[PDB]
């Protein structure tokens, strides 16, 4: 069985210990009933947190057999990166998009802490992602992908745990009543979800479509919504080498978090990159998520911006096309799957591997920003080009004149099927005042 | 022969006159050569003309045998609620996108005019449209489609022509010399072409890529990147039937003219929809614009929100990929093609119908707003469906496990790819660290 | 609850009664524990039926409150057209094809069967669909479309039905002790399912991939791959108007199910249409199975020789695509969700109204045939138009030249793009030998 | 200037020297005339040929400067398999391919030709194809990225070479009046273009669609359709080592163009391959042809039958849907551009490189074949995975009903979407007898 309903008495079992007061009730619990929790803390470079070393020697102090702090920013970052080169992003509303942050943050942490358990000689995992969302079923992927003899214990399929820690307050209570002055965190009127590569906010008030968010406190960046925060104008470079984001404002990094780090400082000071979508499960029903992501934002419109002054038509289409079916499949904890790596392995080595150039923006309010300048050794777009200036063209008109003649069957094909159309009721005429109109309801 | 190179003396020419230099000097040059020609000016609702009934007048003035005002305001709009309808937008920059406007406006002006011309005996078009843009082919089949027997007098392939009018100097002569005081308009540092939907502007020193929006003054809105320029916080809402914008701030409206007149009056005010864009010419050669359709974004905006409450994720995918698909075909001025009706008339039939809905937006500057409410008796979105709060779920905690379970083959079969791949040397390891790792130049 | 896990005394229950011995038995128990089951037999035209109305009988002696036949033929055939216009089909291997028609034929009796019990106020369904197959979740789906209120009882989830029901053997013994002289059937190496589009054969010995196609009696056709059965090559006609298919042989039918019945009858005498899959179950596990559908693969070859002639290649591909991942949206059991219904509706106007034509075939053995002539008034393709016999020409050699010439700047940028591939390793060279050559491992 | 119309007398002009009377003649001619041709014969495996080295002696002995054969087998069978691999054919009949032998052919000669040209300081290539077809075009790409200071002169444009070897019969009194009793080959009623991988038969008599294979005189394989040609049943065996054809019939190969002949000789006695496609080319204008490729026919159905037993429907279907898309690339002469690499080497290196394994076919005449055994130490299908028989399996009978469960919140808005959509007129009802009906014309 891979799932599993009981406490696993006497055995080894792993925590994500994120040091709230669900995974500090929860190992304090399984030590006490009998088994044996090892935590292991993610370093996600997370925007609200400051002492992450804290978090191990809490979960000892709970009663974790040992608890480490497994880093995972640099590997978080390339992915990240990864996602950024290839537009791995599926869920967009008037063109703002949502970065997969959660995603990404899942593809990373649900395979290097189970393969850190796996070294610890760790074979059963206590992860308490709930039965609603996305991440029960990505963690259990990317577990399993990661240790064939892996089984997960879901706590909330336990009556005891059910009856002993079924709510914050009864869970706040077990902490008290076994010798922890437990202090609770405010309450806030919503849930948040962090890593390096973005904030993700859902659940209570954001459930209601008619919130918004401004009822959110940004934890990457400014209320850029609030008149009364100033927010000058700011001019931003971003410079990359083959697909490799290497340089902001003419400055390098010493590594590839340093440098996402600070596009994060730079984009969180306008509110760059935030969105809200209503977006559909892995299940198939619907949420609703605010989300921030500075960094990220600020790197995907350089790159992109890049990208249109290099490649031909067709490989931008299948830049937008592969990009956004991988990032469903990012979505769905399919990051690592055959179809996913094809595309991802695909747009790195043929789109990213020639995007070498730098781009300027001004960044002002939220969403609001101006390209400046557009550079690069390998761009196709030349000013001289298409110019009606001078002269000297690579083609006559003349040429024109015999590449539209070479249109003309095909012109009149498709004449015909006016007529055709308009035969068999699809068109009120292949014209009537010129324009033809297709018959259906959105014709009035 | 289809394209004629000499002007046709003593025949019936028609002339799409806009009342500018080089369509008053062409119109009074073919008469005094011997041609008849007809003029004709689509009234396209455009933001920078006051004065469309002038312009006939100019045309008899000149040499028009006749010249008429054909209006285009009703099909134009029509074309571009369409396009909304369909997402059929393919050239984005970091999710901004611009909305094809320039591409609407030539398959309702190459219909139309042609068909004007066509009621009255005319049967050649002197377009001057060049041999360097898209436009020369977008009104060579437009023009084709609706009329068979159809020629096509491009002036810049009479020499005598070249020798006479061969650029803004010499036409301005030229009237002078033909007894005209004319007066060329102020030069600007850029082109222009605009409708109701939208502005586009190009050429001079927008073909340098260091040169930005800031060297435009926008015709359809504010220039919201100057500090200067005071822009409150304005509240907004759109609402659709089936499909169809209808009301704007609580108001509804005598026709859709109207409608999208008050959509660009609103979104102006704010710099609503702004892009600059490197894009592919027809040609397979690259231009640059800077794009104002401040009506377009503002519809779009809360027309794909609705969509994301109310259409299944499948659905929103092909309304993604095949809305772009169109938005090229469009581009390429085959919008009346199969190809392109099948994609329109789908998405306008399964998707559109269903967008019933209402959206509140508060703008600010440029492309910096905020959802704040959205609502429709279609949502599939619902509070209720997946809160963690009270109870009451159509799946339970059991069920989620069994959906969990029916992975397993496939995980199984992904671990085995994963192995497989790390065996023919596309990953260095099924893990290292956890992660796979692939094998390319980006992996650093 | 949706699902029941055991028997609903004194309570109306639909079973779908095909008359064999599992439907046969457990609608005796059903009675005999205290439901009031009601019979339901789908007439799908099954080859290998010759009795229909014995099979209502069968079910009133052995207890149903009620029992009918419900006819499903013409809706069976309807929906069959649509996927051969729509070209619905996604399980190809080497080119040949798997009609989809046990997902047609359960789209059908799913909806039409659970309305019929809807209408005698019958709101549970007794479906044995087993818990491994398609079928199952095919059902499930269709029928809770169809009545909101259904519920649908699993026997084999009921204890007590196991123990009695285990098996055939188990079965057989309880028809016997319930007073009924039953006969089994003969044993086959193989099971079967059949309607009048297609017949599939699976499990048993045909889960061995070294059993083939030898091991079957074919029941739609003959064993072509038999020396020994005299098989004539035959000229056969195959004439469609916009996009319908209406005569076979110069001849026309009272309706399209006596159509089938004789596509069915042609395609039969030579084996046309038969293939061995591997396929993907929606559940993510791989099964196989031979098919037979001669009539289908008879209209097939004939509407795709037409649609050759008659589209041009933007259309071809879309019908292409869109078709194949309606037949994959078939499979699933989502023919009447709005991503199916969109791509089907799409096909049928735009693709299939100008399917209007006929071609000629010479039918041998098996898939062995060749075209003999092609015609339609809606041809695109002339022998006159790119003949290089006689002359007159739509283009000269001179336009081919400048159209040739507007490639230049593409060249241009393909070919940097190859030195530049070379340089950062994806290419040996942009040349060596002159050939690009990708650095991959299929590289020898 | 790229393109000349005049012969570049006094300077080296490359000839791609097939022996046949077009070539004969233009060289005989462009040396008469003071140009110094330099011939180059491509070695392609032509089934046809039996003399290759006789070729360059003859081009010698009509007046070149310098004769080679350059042998483009092993960059022919190289890319063939590529294409194998990557399923890149795009025009299909009712299942039957055609395997794009001449668009593969071409990018090999077009490559190598002019690369041995530039190699000998040759930067002139007087390629006579003509300016109705696709192979103008395709030559003229290859042949730029090759050498961008290539210079192409097309004979057809030269009024000189117009007057004097206008057609066969002047081409034939030319040779004579030069000295040579040049004897012309025997007419057929169609034309003909082979390399080792294929051969097309197109325009003549082949231009009428009532004409046949039946006129054809096959040159790689037999006439199937003749019942007095005996062709025995024949077993045969086609093995795959990561996604590379090594063995037939048990047996290895020295090298890929020995394997290649040997599929040929295999294929070739049944006449596998062979198909009849009305295509569209470049230009947008249909032709007709009639094919042969045993060989690759071959390959393409043991390996197809392998990837259905290897892959997820996810990486099936990006192999169906990337392929297609690749051989339109491939058609168009684009096998060597960004979007068509990046295509190829994704399937390349994670669909082909698991296709490790062995078909079993039994081939009779022409398509008809049968599948006997299917082997692979990589296959995802295994016969105890899904079967009912015996027991132990991954998933339980109640985890299936929870997976179906999780399905109930989107068929809820299934439904209610068909309650839309009768609602706003595009289904009659969302039932009526229970299915639900289209509003189109195909709905009778």
Same mark, same amino acid.
């Given at each position: 069985?891979?799932?599993?309903?009981?406490?696993?008495?006497?055995?080894?079992?792993?925590?994500?210990?994120?040091?709230?007061?669900?995974?500090?009730?929860?190992?304090?619990?399984?030590?006490?009933?009998?088994?044996?929790?090892?935590?292991?803390?993610?370093?996600?470079?997370?925007?609200?947190?400051?002492?992450?070393?804290?978090?191990?020697?809490?979960?000892?102090?709970?009663?974790?057999?040992?608890?480490?702090?497994?880093?995972?920013?640099?590997?978080?970052?390339?992915?990240?990166?990864?996602?950024?080169?290839?537009?791995?992003?599926?869920?967009?509303?008037?063109?703002?998009?949502?970065?997969?942050?959660?995603?990404?943050?899942?593809?990373?942490?649900?395979?290097?802490?189970?393969?850190?358990?796996?070294?610890?000689?760790?074979?059963?995992?206590?992860?308490?992602?709930?039965?609603?969302?996305?991440?029960?079923?990505?963690?259990?992927?990317?577990?399993?992908?990661?240790?064939?003899?892996?089984?997960?214990?879901?706590?909330?399929?336990?009556?005891?745990?059910?009856?002993?820690?079924?709510?914050?307050?009864?869970?706040?209570?077990?902490?008290?009543?076994?010798?922890?002055?437990?202090?609770?965190?405010?309450?806030?009127?919503?849930?948040?979800?962090?890593?390096?590569?973005?904030?993700?906010?859902?659940?209570?008030?954001?459930?209601?479509?008619?919130?918004?968010?401004?009822?959110?406190?940004?934890?990457?960046?400014?209320?850029?919504?609030?008149?009364?925060?100033?927010?000058?104008?700011?001019?931003?470079?971003?410079?990359?080498?083959?697909?490799?984001?290497?340089? =902001?404002? +003419?400055?390098?990094?010493? #590594?590839?978090? $340093?440098?996402?780090?600070?596009?994060? @400082?730079?984009? !969180? /000071?306008?509110?760059?990159?935030?969105?809200?979508?209503?977006?559909?499960?892995?299940?198939?029903?619907?949420?609703?998520?605010?989300?921030?992501?500075?960094?990220?934002?600020?790197?995907?419109?350089?790159?992109?911006?890049? =990208?249109? +002054?290099?490649?031909?038509? #067709?490989?931008? $289409?299948?830049?937008?096309?592969?990009? @956004?079916?991988? !990032? /469903?499949?990012?979505?769905?904890?399919?990051?690592?799957?055959?179809?996913?790596?094809?595309?991802?392995?695909?747009?790195?080595?043929?789109?990213?591997?020639?995007?070498?150039?730098?781009?300027?923006?001004?960044?002002?309010?939220?969403?609001?920003?101006?390209?400046?300048?557009?550079?690069?050794?390998?761009?196709?777009?030349?000013?001289?080009?298409?110019?009606?200036?001078?002269?000297?063209?690579?083609?006559?008109?003349?040429?024109?004149?015999?590449?539209?003649?070479?249109?003309?069957?095909?012109?009149?094909?498709?004449?015909?099927?006016?007529?055709?159309?308009?035969?068999?009721?699809?068109?009120?005429?292949?014209?009537?005042?010129?324009?033809?109109?297709?018959?259906?309801?959105?014709?009035?």
């Amino acid at each position: 069985t891979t799932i599993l309903k009981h406490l696993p008495v006497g055995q080894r079992i792993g925590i994500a210990f994120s040091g709230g007061l669900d995974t500090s009730a929860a190992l304090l619990w399984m030590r006490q009933k009998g088994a044996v929790p090892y935590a292991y803390t993610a370093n996600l470079g997370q925007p609200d947190e400051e002492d992450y070393d804290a978090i191990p020697r809490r979960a000892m102090e709970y009663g974790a057999e040992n608890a480490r702090l497994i880093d995972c920013r640099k590997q978080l970052v390339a992915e990240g990166i990864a996602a950024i080169q290839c537009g791995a992003f599926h869920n967009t509303t008037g063109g703002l998009t949502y970065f997969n942050t959660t995603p990404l943050g899942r593809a990373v942490t649900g395979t290097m802490l189970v393969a850190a358990m796996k070294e610890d000689g760790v074979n059963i995992w206590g992860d308490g992602s709930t039965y609603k969302g996305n991440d029960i079923e990505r963690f259990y992927r990317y577990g399993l992908l990661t240790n064939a003899e892996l089984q997960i214990y879901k706590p909330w399929l336990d009556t005891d745990f059910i009856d002993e820690l079924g709510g914050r307050h009864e869970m706040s209570e077990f902490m008290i009543a076994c010798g922890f002055d437990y202090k609770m965190s405010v309450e806030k009127a919503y849930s948040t979800d962090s890593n390096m590569l973005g904030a993700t906010h859902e659940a209570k008030d954001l459930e209601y479509l008619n919130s918004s968010v401004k009822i959110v406190n940004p934890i990457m960046g400014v209320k850029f919504w609030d008149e009364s925060v100033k927010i000058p104008a700011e001019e931003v470079t971003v410079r990359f080498e083959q697909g490799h984001p290497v340089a =902001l404002n +003419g400055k390098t990094f010493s #590594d590839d978090v $340093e440098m996402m780090l600070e596009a994060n @400082r730079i984009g !969180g /000071r306008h509110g760059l990159g935030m969105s809200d979508q209503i977006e559909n499960r892995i299940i198939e029903a619907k949420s609703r998520g605010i989300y921030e992501a500075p960094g990220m934002a600020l790197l995907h419109i350089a790159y992109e911006r890049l =990208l249109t +002054g290099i490649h031909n038509e #067709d490989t931008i $289409e299948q830049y937008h096309a592969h990009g @956004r079916q991988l !990032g /469903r499949l990012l979505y769905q904890g399919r990051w690592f799957d055959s179809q996913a790596l094809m595309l991802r392995d695909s747009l790195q080595r043929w789109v990213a591997s020639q995007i070498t150039g730098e781009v300027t923006l001004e960044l002002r309010r939220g969403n609001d920003y101006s390209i400046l300048n557009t550079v690069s050794e390998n761009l196709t777009y030349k000013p001289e080009r298409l110019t009606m200036e001078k002269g000297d063209s690579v083609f006559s008109p003349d040429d024109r004149i015999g590449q539209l003649t070479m249109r003309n069957l095909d012109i009149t094909d498709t004449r015909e099927k006016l007529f055709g159309y308009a035969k068999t009721g699809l068109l009120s005429s292949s014209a009537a005042s010129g324009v033809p109109q297709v018959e259906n309801l959105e014709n009035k």
